[PDB]
Design an enzyme around this catalytic site. Structure first.
Site, PDB file in Angstrom:
ATOM      1  N   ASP A 127      69.694  23.143   3.481  1.00  0.00           N
ATOM      2  CA  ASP A 127      69.012  24.198   4.288  1.00  0.00           C
ATOM      3  C   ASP A 127      67.926  24.904   3.460  1.00  0.00           C
ATOM      4  O   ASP A 127      67.843  26.124   3.536  1.00  0.00           O
ATOM      5  CB  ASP A 127      69.974  25.216   4.898  1.00  0.00           C
ATOM      6  N   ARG A 131      63.930  31.744   3.775  1.00  0.00           N
ATOM      7  CA  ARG A 131      65.015  32.698   4.096  1.00  0.00           C
ATOM      8  C   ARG A 131      66.178  32.498   3.123  1.00  0.00           C
ATOM      9  O   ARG A 131      66.973  33.422   2.995  1.00  0.00           O
ATOM     10  CB  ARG A 131      65.478  32.486   5.534  1.00  0.00           C
ATOM     11  N   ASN A 132      66.259  31.333   2.479  1.00  0.00           N
ATOM     12  CA  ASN A 132      67.336  31.043   1.498  1.00  0.00           C
ATOM     13  C   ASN A 132      66.750  31.127   0.089  1.00  0.00           C
ATOM     14  O   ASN A 132      67.284  30.498  -0.823  1.00  0.00           O
ATOM     15  CB  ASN A 132      68.033  29.721   1.803  1.00  0.00           C
ATOM     16  N   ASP A 145      72.056  30.019  -1.905  1.00  0.00           N
ATOM     17  CA  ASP A 145      72.922  29.433  -0.840  1.00  0.00           C
ATOM     18  C   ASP A 145      72.769  27.910  -0.738  1.00  0.00           C
ATOM     19  O   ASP A 145      72.871  27.382   0.361  1.00  0.00           O
ATOM     20  CB  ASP A 145      72.751  30.222   0.457  1.00  0.00           C
TER      21      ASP A 145
HETATM   22  C1  LIG Z   1      65.298  36.513   4.442  1.00  0.00           C
HETATM   23  C2  LIG Z   1      66.788  36.588   4.720  1.00  0.00           C
HETATM   24  C3  LIG Z   1      67.384  37.937   4.426  1.00  0.00           C
HETATM   25  O1  LIG Z   1      66.892  38.956   4.898  1.00  0.00           O
HETATM   26  N1  LIG Z   1      68.489  38.010   3.661  1.00  0.00           N
HETATM   27  C4  LIG Z   1      69.265  36.861   3.163  1.00  0.00           C
HETATM   28  C5  LIG Z   1      70.037  37.437   1.992  1.00  0.00           C
HETATM   29  C6  LIG Z   1      70.401  38.828   2.497  1.00  0.00           C
HETATM   30  C7  LIG Z   1      69.110  39.262   3.247  1.00  0.00           C
HETATM   31  C8  LIG Z   1      68.655  39.893   1.909  1.00  0.00           C
HETATM   32  C9  LIG Z   1      70.148  40.036   1.552  1.00  0.00           C
HETATM   33  C10 LIG Z   1      70.771  41.320   2.010  1.00  0.00           C
HETATM   34  O2  LIG Z   1      70.490  39.761   0.174  1.00  0.00           O
HETATM   35  C11 LIG Z   1      69.951  40.396  -0.894  1.00  0.00           C
HETATM   36  N2  LIG Z   1      69.098  41.432  -0.754  1.00  0.00           N
HETATM   37  C12 LIG Z   1      68.581  42.019  -1.851  1.00  0.00           C
HETATM   38  C13 LIG Z   1      67.692  43.109  -1.610  1.00  0.00           C
HETATM   39  C14 LIG Z   1      67.122  43.501  -0.382  1.00  0.00           C
HETATM   40  N3  LIG Z   1      66.335  44.559  -0.500  1.00  0.00           N
HETATM   41  N4  LIG Z   1      66.384  44.869  -1.832  1.00  0.00           N
HETATM   42  C15 LIG Z   1      65.621  46.003  -2.346  1.00  0.00           C
HETATM   43  C16 LIG Z   1      67.183  44.018  -2.517  1.00  0.00           C
HETATM   44  C17 LIG Z   1      68.914  41.581  -3.137  1.00  0.00           C
HETATM   45  N5  LIG Z   1      69.777  40.520  -3.276  1.00  0.00           N
HETATM   46  N6  LIG Z   1      70.211  39.952  -4.437  1.00  0.00           N
HETATM   47  C18 LIG Z   1      71.028  38.971  -4.044  1.00  0.00           C
HETATM   48  C19 LIG Z   1      71.125  38.904  -2.657  1.00  0.00           C
HETATM   49  C20 LIG Z   1      70.296  39.925  -2.170  1.00  0.00           C
END
Ligand SMILES: *CCC(=O)N1CC[C@@H]2[C@H]1C[C@]2(C)Oc1nc(-c2cnn(C)c2)cn2nccc12
Length: 256
Positions: A127, A131-132, A145
């Site tokens: 995938d 987005r990943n 992922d």
């Molecule tokens: C584009 C897809 C998407 O929005 N996401 C897939 C992964 C999860 C969301 C982002 C999130 C919540 O994972 C993580 N977000 C952050 C993050 C978001 N905003 N800030 C300031 C930091 C940081 N991360 N580190 C590992 C996973 C995430």
């Protein structure tokens, strides 16, 4: 492979993913981590736990490092490297960054380095998409992922806009299926987070991809950059390139 949950201090909610919320926290009160909390009934938990032993053995600088799992209770926790700047798709859609073409090519290089590592380990992402992908505090892009699609229990999960024709018609996954997805991921970066096949539904996209439709040249992409991404979309999979070849092509453009 097991991490003690009590060694985690929960600080901030980061958002939601496919398997539930993600929280920011400290591991032993010193190291930043992301704590993915997996909603019950959404993961083939027994199969993922056995696979986590493989994923933890994958170490690369452009791969989101999996530090360990918390499985003694439900919901189970996935503890990963923290990526301060969040998801790549959101990063690209933030127009304030005023990106130069070279920054976009570096994001493409970052993912390509990670995917070459996986190809060398015979590990398929299954995938690959923006987005990943996640971006750190220094603008480094990393792949996340990888392989987790194999443990999602939701039937409706499908990434048609990142799927080659042999997957849409026969569910034939291979290294070449990841290569196609990388071509789309390059298009996503050079289009600043535009949805692939923006004018079509998921059904029309596959219908058009069977007829031969290919993504167009993004405005920010040169002929040479488009050529790399179009190489990933040859109708014959055996004619699509390797991650080794794509990296050599990206470095050639980065030097020129
Ligand atoms: C584009 C897809 C998407 O929005 N996401 C897939 C992964 C999860 C969301 C982002 C999130 C919540 O994972 C993580 N977000 C952050 C993050 C978001 N905003 N800030 C300031 C930091 C940081 N991360 N580190 C590992 C996973 C995430």
């Amino acid at each position: 492979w097991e991490i003690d949950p009590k060694d985690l201090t929960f600080l901030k909610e980061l958002g939601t993913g496919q398997f539930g919320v993600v929280k920011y926290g400290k591991w032993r009160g010193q190291y930043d981590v992301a704590i993915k909390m997996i909603k019950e009934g959404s993961m083939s938990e027994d199969e993922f736990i056995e696979e986590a032993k493989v994923m933890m053995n994958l170490s690369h600088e452009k791969l989101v490092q999996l530090y360990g799992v918390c499985t003694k209770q439900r919901p189970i926790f996935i503890i990963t490297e923290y990526m301060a700047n969040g998801c790549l798709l959101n990063y690209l859609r933030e127009m304030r960054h005023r990106f130069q073409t070279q920054q976009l090519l570096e994001m493409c290089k970052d993912v390509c380095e990670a995917m070459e590592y996986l190809e060398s380990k015979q590990f398929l992402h299954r995938d690959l998409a923006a987005r990943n992908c996640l971006v750190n505090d220094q603008g480094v892009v990393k792949v996340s992922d990888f392989g987790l699609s194999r443990y999602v229990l939701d039937d409706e999960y499908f990434p048609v806009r990142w799927s080659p024709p042999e997957v849409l018609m026969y569910s034939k996954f291979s290294s070449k299926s990841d290569i196609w997805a990388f071509g789309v991921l390059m298009w996503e970066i050079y289009s600043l987070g535009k949805m692939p096949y923006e004018r079509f539904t998921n059904s029309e996209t596959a219908e058009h991809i069977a007829q031969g439709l290919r993504l167009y040249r993004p405005h920010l992409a040169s002929e040479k950059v488009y050529t790399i991404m179009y190489s990933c979309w040859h109708e014959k999979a055996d004619e699509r390139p390797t991650f080794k070849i794509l990296l050599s092509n990206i470095l050639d453009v980065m030097d020129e």
